[PDB]
GROMACS .gro file of C-alpha atoms in nm:
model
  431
    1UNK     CA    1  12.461   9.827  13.000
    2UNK     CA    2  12.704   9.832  12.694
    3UNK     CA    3  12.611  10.049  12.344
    4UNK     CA    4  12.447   9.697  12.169
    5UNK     CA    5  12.187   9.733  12.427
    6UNK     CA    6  12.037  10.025  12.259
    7UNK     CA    7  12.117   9.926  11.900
    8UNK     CA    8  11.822   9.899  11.720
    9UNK     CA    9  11.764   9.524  11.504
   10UNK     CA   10  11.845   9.413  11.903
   11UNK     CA   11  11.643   9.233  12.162
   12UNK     CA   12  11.797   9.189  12.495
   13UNK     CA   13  11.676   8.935  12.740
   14UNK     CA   14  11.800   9.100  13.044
   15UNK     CA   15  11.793   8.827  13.310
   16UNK     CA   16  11.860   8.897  13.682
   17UNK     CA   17  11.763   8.695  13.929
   18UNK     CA   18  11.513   8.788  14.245
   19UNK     CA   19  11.652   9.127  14.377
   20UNK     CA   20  11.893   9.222  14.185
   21UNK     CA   21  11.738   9.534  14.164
   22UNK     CA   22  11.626   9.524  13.740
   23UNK     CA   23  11.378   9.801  13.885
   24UNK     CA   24  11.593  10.018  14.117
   25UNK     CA   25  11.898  10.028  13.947
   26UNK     CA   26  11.912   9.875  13.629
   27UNK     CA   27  11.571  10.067  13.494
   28UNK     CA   28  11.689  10.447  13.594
   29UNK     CA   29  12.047  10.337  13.494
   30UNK     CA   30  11.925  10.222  13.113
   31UNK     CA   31  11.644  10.547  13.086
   32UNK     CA   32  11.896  10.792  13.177
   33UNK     CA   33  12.104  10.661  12.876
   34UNK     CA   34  11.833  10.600  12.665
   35UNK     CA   35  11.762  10.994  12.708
   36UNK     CA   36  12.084  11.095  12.614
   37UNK     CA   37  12.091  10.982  12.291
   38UNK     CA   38  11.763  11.110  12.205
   39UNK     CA   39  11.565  10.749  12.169
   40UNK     CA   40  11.197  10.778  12.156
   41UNK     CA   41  11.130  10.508  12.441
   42UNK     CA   42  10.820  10.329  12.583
   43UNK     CA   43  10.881  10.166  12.941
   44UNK     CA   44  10.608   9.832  13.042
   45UNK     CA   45  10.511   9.771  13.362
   46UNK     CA   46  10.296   9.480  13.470
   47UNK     CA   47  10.073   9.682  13.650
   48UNK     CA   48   9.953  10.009  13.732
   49UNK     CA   49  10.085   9.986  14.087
   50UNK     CA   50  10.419   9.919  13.938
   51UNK     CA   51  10.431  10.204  13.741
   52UNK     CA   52  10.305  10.465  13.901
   53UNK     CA   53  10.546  10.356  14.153
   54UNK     CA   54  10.816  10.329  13.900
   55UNK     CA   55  10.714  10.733  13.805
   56UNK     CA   56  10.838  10.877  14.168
   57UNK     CA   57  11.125  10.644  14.104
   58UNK     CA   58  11.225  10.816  13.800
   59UNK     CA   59  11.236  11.135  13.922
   60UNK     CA   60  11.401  11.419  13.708
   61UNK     CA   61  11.402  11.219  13.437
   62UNK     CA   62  11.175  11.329  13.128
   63UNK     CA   63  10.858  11.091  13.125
   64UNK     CA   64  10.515  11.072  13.064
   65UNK     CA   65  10.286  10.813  13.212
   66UNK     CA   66   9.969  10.630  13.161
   67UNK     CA   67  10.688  11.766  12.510
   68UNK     CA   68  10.862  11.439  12.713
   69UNK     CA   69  11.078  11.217  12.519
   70UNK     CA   70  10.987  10.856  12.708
   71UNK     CA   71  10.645  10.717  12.772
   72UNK     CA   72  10.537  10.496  13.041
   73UNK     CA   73  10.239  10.257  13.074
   74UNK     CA   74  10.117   9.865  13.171
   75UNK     CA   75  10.146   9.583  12.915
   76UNK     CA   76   9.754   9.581  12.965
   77UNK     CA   77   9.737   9.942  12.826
   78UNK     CA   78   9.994   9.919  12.537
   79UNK     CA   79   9.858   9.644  12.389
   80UNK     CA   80   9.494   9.802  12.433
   81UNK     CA   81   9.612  10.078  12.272
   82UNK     CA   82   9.783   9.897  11.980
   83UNK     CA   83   9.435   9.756  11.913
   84UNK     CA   84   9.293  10.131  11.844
   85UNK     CA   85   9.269  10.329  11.559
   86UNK     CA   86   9.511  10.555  11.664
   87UNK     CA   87   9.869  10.489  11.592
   88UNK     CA   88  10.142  10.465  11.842
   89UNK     CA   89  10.487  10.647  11.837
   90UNK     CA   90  10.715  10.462  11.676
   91UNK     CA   91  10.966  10.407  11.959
   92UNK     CA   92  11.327  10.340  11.899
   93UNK     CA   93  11.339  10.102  12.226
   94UNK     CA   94  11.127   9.927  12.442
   95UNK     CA   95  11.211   9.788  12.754
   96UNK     CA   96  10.955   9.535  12.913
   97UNK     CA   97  10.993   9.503  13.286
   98UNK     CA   98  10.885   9.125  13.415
   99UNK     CA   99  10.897   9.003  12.999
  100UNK     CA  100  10.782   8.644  13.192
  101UNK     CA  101  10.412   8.778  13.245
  102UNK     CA  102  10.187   8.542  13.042
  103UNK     CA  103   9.864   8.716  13.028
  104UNK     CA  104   9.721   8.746  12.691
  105UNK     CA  105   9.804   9.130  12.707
  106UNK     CA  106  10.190   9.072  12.765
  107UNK     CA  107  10.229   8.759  12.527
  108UNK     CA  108  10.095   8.999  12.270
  109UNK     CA  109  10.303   9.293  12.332
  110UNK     CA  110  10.673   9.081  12.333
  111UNK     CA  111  10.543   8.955  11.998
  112UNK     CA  112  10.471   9.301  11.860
  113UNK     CA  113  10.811   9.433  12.066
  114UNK     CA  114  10.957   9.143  11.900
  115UNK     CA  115  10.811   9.242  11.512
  116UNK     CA  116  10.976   9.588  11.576
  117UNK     CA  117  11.304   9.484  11.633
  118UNK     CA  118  11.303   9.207  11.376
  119UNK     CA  119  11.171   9.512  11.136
  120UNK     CA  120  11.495   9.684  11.288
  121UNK     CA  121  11.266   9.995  11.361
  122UNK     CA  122  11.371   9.947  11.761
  123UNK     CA  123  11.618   9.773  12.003
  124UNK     CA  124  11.399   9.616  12.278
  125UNK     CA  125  11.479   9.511  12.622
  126UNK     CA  126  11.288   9.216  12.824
  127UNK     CA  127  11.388   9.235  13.186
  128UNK     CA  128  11.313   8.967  13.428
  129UNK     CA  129  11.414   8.651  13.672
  130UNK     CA  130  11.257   8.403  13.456
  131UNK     CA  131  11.339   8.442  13.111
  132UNK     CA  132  11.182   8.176  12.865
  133UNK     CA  133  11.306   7.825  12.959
  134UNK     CA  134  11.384   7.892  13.296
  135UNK     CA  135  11.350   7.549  13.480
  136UNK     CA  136  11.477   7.619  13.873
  137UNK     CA  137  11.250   7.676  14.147
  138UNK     CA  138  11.517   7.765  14.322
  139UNK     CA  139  11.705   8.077  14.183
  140UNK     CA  140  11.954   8.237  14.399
  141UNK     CA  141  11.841   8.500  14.597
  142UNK     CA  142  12.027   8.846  14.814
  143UNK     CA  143  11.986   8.642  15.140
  144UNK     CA  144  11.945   8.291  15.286
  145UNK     CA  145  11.630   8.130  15.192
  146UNK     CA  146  11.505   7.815  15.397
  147UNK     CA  147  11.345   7.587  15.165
  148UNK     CA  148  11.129   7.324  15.362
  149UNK     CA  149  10.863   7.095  15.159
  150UNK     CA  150  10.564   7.065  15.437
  151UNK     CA  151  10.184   6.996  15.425
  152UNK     CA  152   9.996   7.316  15.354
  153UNK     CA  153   9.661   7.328  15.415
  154UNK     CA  154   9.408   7.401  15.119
  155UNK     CA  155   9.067   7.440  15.259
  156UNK     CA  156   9.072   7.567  15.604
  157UNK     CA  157   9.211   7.338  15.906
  158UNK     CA  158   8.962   7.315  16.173
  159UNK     CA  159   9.188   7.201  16.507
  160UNK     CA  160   9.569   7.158  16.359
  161UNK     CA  161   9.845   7.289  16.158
  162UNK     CA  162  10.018   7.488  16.419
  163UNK     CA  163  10.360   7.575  16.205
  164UNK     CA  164  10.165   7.812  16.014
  165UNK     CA  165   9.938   8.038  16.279
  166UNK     CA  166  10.234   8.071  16.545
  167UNK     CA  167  10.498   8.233  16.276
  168UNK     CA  168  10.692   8.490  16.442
  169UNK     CA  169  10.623   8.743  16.124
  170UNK     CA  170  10.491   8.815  15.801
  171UNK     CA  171  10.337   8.569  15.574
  172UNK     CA  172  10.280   8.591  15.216
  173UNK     CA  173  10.036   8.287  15.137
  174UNK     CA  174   9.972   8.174  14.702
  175UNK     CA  175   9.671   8.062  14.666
  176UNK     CA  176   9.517   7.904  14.357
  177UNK     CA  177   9.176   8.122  14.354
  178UNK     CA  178   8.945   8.367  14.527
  179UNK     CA  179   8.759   8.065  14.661
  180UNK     CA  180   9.064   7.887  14.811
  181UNK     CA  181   9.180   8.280  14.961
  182UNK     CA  182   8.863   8.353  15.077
  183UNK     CA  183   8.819   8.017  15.314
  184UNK     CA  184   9.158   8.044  15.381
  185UNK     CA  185   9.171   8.432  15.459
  186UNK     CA  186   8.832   8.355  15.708
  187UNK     CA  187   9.027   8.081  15.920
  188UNK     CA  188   9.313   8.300  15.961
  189UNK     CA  189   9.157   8.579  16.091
  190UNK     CA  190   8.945   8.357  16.356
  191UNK     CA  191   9.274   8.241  16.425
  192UNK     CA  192   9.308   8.624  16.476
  193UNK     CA  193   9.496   8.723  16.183
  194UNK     CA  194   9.478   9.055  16.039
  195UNK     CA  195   9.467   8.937  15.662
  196UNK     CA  196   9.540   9.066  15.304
  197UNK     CA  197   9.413   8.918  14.961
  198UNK     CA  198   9.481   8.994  14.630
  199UNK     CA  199   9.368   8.914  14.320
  200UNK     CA  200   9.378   9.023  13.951
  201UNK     CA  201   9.087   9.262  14.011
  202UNK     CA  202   9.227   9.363  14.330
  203UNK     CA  203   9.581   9.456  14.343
  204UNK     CA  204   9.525   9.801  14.195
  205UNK     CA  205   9.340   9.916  14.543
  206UNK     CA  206   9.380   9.716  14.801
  207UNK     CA  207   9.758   9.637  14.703
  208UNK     CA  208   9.882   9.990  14.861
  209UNK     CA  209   9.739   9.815  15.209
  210UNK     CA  210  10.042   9.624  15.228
  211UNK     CA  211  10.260   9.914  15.285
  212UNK     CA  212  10.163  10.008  15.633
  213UNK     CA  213  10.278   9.746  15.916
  214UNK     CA  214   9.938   9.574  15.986
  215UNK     CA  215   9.871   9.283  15.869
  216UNK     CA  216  10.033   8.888  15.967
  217UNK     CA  217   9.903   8.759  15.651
  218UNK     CA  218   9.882   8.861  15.290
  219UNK     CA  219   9.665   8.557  15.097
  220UNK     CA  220   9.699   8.635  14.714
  221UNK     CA  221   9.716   8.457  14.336
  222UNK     CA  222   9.913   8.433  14.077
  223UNK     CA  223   9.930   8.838  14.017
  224UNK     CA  224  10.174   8.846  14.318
  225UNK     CA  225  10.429   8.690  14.103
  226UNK     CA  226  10.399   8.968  13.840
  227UNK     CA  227  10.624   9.298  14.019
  228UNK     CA  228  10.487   9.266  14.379
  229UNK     CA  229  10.684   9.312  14.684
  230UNK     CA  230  10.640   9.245  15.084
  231UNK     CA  231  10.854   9.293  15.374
  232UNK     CA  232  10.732   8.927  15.453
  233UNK     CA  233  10.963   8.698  15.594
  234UNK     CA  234  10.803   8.351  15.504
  235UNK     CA  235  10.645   8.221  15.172
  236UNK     CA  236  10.400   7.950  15.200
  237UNK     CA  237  10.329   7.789  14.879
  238UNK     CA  238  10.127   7.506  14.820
  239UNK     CA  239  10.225   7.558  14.422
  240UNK     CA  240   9.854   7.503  14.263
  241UNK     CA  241   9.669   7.732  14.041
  242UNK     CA  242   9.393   7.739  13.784
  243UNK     CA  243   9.437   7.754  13.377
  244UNK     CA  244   9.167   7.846  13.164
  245UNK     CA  245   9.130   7.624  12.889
  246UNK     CA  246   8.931   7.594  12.583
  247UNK     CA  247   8.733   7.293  12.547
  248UNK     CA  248   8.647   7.190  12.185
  249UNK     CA  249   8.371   6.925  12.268
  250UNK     CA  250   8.022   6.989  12.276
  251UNK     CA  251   8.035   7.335  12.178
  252UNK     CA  252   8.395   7.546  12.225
  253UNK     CA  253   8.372   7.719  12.584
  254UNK     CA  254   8.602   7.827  12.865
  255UNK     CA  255   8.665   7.583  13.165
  256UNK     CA  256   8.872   7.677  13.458
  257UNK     CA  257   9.088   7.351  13.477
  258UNK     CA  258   9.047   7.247  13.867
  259UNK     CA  259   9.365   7.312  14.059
  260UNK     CA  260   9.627   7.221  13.877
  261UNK     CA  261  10.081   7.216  14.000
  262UNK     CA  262  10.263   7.587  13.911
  263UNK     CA  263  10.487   7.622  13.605
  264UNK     CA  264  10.818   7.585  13.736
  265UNK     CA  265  10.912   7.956  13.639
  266UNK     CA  266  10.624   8.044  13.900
  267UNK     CA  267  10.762   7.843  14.209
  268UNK     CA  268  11.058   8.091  14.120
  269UNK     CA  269  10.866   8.410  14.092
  270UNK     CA  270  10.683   8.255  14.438
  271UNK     CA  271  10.978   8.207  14.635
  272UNK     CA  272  11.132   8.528  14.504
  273UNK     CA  273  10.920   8.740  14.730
  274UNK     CA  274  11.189   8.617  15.030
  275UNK     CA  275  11.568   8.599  15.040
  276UNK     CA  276  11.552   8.999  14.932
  277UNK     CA  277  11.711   9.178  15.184
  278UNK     CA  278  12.070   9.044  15.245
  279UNK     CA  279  12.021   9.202  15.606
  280UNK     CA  280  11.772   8.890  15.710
  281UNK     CA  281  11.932   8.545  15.717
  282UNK     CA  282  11.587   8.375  15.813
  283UNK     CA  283  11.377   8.412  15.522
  284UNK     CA  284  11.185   8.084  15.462
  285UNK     CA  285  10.987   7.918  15.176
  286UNK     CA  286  10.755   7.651  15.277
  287UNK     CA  287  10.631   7.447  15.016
  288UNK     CA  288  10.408   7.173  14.875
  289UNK     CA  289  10.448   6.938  14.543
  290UNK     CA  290  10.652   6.998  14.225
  291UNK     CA  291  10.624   7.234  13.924
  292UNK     CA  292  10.562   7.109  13.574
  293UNK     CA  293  10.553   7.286  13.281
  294UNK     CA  294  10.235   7.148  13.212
  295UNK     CA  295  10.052   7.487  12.975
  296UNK     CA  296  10.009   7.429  12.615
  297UNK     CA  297   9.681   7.434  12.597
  298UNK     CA  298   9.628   7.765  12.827
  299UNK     CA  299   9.327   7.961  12.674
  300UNK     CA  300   9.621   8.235  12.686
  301UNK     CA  301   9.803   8.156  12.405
  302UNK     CA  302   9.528   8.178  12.185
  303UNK     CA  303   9.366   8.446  12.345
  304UNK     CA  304   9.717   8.670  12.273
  305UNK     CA  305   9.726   8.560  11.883
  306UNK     CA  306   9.352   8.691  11.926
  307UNK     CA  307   9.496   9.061  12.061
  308UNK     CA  308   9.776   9.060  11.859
  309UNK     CA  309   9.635   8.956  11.493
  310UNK     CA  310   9.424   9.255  11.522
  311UNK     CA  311   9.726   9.433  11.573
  312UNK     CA  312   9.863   9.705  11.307
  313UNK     CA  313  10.227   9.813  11.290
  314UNK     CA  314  10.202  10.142  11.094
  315UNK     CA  315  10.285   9.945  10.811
  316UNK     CA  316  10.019   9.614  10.679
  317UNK     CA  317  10.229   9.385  10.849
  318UNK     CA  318  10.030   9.155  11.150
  319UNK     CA  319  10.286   9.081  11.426
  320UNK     CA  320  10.411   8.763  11.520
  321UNK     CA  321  10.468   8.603  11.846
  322UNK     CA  322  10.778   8.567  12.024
  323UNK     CA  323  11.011   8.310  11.914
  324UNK     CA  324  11.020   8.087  12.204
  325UNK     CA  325  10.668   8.134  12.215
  326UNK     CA  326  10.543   8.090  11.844
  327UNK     CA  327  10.519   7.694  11.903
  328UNK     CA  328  10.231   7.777  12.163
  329UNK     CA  329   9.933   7.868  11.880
  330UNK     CA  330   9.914   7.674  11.585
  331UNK     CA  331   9.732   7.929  11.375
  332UNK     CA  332   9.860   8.155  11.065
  333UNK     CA  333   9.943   8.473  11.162
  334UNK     CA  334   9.601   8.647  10.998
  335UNK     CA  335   9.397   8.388  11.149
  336UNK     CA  336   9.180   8.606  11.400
  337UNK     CA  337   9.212   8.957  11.204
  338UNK     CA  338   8.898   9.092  11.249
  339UNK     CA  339   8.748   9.406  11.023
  340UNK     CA  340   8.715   9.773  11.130
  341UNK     CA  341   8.356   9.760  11.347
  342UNK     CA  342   8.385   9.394  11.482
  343UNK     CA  343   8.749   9.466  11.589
  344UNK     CA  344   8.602   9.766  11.779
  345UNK     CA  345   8.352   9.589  11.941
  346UNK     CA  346   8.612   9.350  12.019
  347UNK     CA  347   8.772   9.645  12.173
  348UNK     CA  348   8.481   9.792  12.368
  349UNK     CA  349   8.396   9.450  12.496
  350UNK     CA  350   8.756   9.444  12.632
  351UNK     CA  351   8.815   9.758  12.790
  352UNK     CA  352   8.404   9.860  12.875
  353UNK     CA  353   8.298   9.539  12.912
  354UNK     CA  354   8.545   9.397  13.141
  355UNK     CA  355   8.522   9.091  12.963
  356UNK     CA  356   8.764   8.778  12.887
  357UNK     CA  357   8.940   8.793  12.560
  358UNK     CA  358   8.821   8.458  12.424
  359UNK     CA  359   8.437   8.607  12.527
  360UNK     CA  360   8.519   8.938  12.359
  361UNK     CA  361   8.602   8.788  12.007
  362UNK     CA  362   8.346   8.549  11.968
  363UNK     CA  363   8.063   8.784  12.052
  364UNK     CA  364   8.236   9.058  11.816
  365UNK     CA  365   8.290   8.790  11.535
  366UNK     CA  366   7.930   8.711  11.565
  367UNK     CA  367   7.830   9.052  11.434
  368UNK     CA  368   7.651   9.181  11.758
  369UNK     CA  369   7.662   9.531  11.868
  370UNK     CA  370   7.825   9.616  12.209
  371UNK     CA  371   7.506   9.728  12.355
  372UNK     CA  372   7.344   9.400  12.228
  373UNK     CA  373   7.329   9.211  12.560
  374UNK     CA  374   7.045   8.920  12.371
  375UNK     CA  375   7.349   8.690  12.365
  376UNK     CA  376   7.362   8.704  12.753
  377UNK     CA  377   7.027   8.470  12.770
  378UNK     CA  378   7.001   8.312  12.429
  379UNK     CA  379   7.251   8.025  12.496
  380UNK     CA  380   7.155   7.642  12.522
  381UNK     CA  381   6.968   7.500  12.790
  382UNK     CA  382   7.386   7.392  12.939
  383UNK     CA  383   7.508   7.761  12.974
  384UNK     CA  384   7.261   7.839  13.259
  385UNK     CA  385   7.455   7.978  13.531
  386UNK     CA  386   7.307   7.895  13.875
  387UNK     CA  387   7.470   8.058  14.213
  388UNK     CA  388   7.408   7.841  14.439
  389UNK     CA  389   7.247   7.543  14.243
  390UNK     CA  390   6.974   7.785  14.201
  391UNK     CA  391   6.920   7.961  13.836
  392UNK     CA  392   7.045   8.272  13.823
  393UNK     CA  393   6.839   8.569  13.713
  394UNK     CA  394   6.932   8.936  13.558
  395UNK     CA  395   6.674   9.218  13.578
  396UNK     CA  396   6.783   9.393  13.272
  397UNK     CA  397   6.767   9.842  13.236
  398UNK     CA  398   6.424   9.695  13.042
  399UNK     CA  399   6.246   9.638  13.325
  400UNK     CA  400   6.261   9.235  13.245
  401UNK     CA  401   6.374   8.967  13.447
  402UNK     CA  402   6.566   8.652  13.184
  403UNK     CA  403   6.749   8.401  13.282
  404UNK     CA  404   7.179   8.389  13.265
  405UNK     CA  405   7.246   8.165  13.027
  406UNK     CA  406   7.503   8.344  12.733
  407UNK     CA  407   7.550   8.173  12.405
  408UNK     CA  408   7.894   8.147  12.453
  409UNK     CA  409   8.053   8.003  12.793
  410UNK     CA  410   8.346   8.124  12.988
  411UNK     CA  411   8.424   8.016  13.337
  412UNK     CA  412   8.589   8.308  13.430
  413UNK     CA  413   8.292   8.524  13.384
  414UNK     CA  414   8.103   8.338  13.712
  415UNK     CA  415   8.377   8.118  13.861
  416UNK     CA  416   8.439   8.395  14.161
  417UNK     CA  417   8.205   8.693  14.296
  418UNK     CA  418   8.365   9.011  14.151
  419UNK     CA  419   8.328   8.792  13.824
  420UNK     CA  420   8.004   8.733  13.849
  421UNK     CA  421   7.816   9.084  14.006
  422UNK     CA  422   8.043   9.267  13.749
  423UNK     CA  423   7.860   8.994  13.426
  424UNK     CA  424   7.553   9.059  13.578
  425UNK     CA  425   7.583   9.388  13.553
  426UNK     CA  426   7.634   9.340  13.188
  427UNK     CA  427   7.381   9.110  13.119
  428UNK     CA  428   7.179   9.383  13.312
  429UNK     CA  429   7.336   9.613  12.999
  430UNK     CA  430   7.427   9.879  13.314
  431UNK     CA  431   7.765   9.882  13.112
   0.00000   0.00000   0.00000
């Protein structure tokens, strides 16, 4: 923490590795000075959880979350928020906790923090243990971390794989989707496990579970790797996940590209959640495959130049990405600007209608309405959606029972079963 940290025209990539305490130490420590010389500052967590833990954690200090000098919110939320009417404060620095988040919501706000400090109306601060280009699976950590390769199983063994059901401790298991938890979470718990999952939709509320001391297993996704801690004492990580990615054939939809190997900055984040407390010495991190940075084409990238090119600085100036990021869209920097209604419907169908950016803009660049649910069963004869190989059907508030078949297809509007009730309930128009 020098005096150039807080000088505005700057953008610090703060990088510490796994447990060096960016959120315990460094945060209050950076705040408290931040205070003292009277910056207006704005403080990003990934999460909710994260920050309303990071509130109690700044006690004394002068903040207000979501008369007080420093706000506090989730990427999620700033960048919603940047994408209202309503202009934001223009903050003299910004500081960013876990900067590596690649959500279209965080890509979006680095690129606007990155604007302001380019503008030199702010000094901005990106903290995290994977800054852009990070290429080691294997970051040091506070404690000894035994890294053993090993076959993990992906479905659900039915007779053997005893390594992973006799563990002494806690077990935090990554798992590439609901439908790989799910099986995975049953066959523990017959194996009587008391299990956790998380997912996107799920840390908010059933995150806090982890906290008490009952559970063996925690089986989660990808959020895990954004701010989430356990007092677990063995990773498993089969390092596979699912991308979104646009298709351009036949008509331009979202597929969920079928399991497919971690970014290498992930296996990091992974293993990260061990090695923490220099008090353990066997902390272990059993894995399967190799990383690749294998993402171009993630629907994310576009989907951010969506959110942020319908992004106003208080100026007429559309923000750009972050540098080391730019190379990721193609487009020109007005390309998805939207006008005043559609952008609010792009809006609404965001933060009301719970639904994927990519799904958002098309159906708002179409003209419709956000109470217009006629696109939800006027697609082609391919977007029918069928549950179990059996059509599915919506009984809308009009008493009528269509078919769910939207004109424009995303996978991750079906492709689990929060997803899906939570669509339906749109098609329904009970949102």
């Amino acid at each position: 923490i020098e005096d150039d940290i807080f000088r505005k025209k700057r953008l610090t990539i703060m990088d510490l590795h796994p447990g060096a305490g960016k959120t315990k130490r460094y945060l209050p420590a950076i705040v408290r000075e931040a205070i003292k010389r009277g910056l207006r500052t704005l403080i990003l967590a990934p999460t909710r959880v994260v920050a309303a833990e990071m509130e109690e954690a700044l006690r004394g200090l002068p903040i207000r979350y979501q008369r007080e000098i420093v706000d506090l919110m989730c990427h999620a939320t700033f960048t919603m928020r940047l994408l209202s009417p309503i202009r934001v404060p223009n903050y003299n620095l910004i500081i960013m906790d876990e900067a590596h988040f690649t959500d279209p919501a965080s890509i979006a706000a680095r690129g606007y923090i990155s604007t302001r400090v380019e503008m030199g109306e702010a000094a901005g601060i990106f903290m995290t243990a994977t800054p852009p280009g990070s290429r080691d699976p294997f970051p040091q950590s506070n404690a000894p971390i035994m890294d053993e390769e090993r076959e993990i199983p992906e479905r659900s063994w039915n007779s053997g794989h005893e390594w992973v059901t006799d563990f002494k401790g806690k077990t935090v298991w990554f798992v590439p989707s609901i439908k790989a938890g799910n099986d995975i979470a049953a066959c523990l718990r017959k194996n009587g496990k008391k299990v956790i999952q998380l997912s996107r939709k799920t840390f908010d509320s059933e995150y806090i579970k982890t906290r008490t001391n009952d559970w063996d297993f925690v089986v989660t996704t990808d959020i895990s790797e954004m701010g989430a801690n356990f007092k677990a004492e063995r990773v498993i990580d089969p390092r596979r996940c699912m991308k979104p990615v646009i298709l351009t054939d036949g008509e331009e939809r979202v597929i969920l590209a079928g399991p497919m190997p971690v970014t290498h900055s992930s296996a990091a984040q992974r293993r990260g959640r061990v090695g923490r407390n220099p008090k353990n010495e066997n902390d272990q991190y059993i894995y399967m495959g190799e990383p690749l940075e294998n993402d171009e084409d993630c629907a994310h990238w576009k989907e951010a130049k969506m959110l942020l090119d319908n992004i106003n600085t208080p100026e007429g100036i559309i923000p750009s990405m972050f540098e080391p990021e730019r190379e990721k869209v193609d487009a020109i920097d007005g390309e998805y600007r939207l006008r005043g209604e559609a952008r609010k419907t792009f809006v609404d169908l965001m933060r009301r209608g719970d639904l994927p950016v990519w799904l958002a803009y098309r159906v708002a660049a179409e003209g419709i309405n956000y109470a217009d649910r006629r696109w939800c069963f006027d697609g082609v004869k391919n977007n029918q959606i069928l549950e179990e190989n059996v059509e599915v059907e919506i009984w809308t508030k009009e008493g009528e029972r269509k078919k769910l078949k939207p004109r424009w297809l995303d996978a991750r509007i079906y492709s689990d079963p929060l997803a899906l009730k939570e669509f339906k309930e749109f098609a329904a128009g009970r949102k």
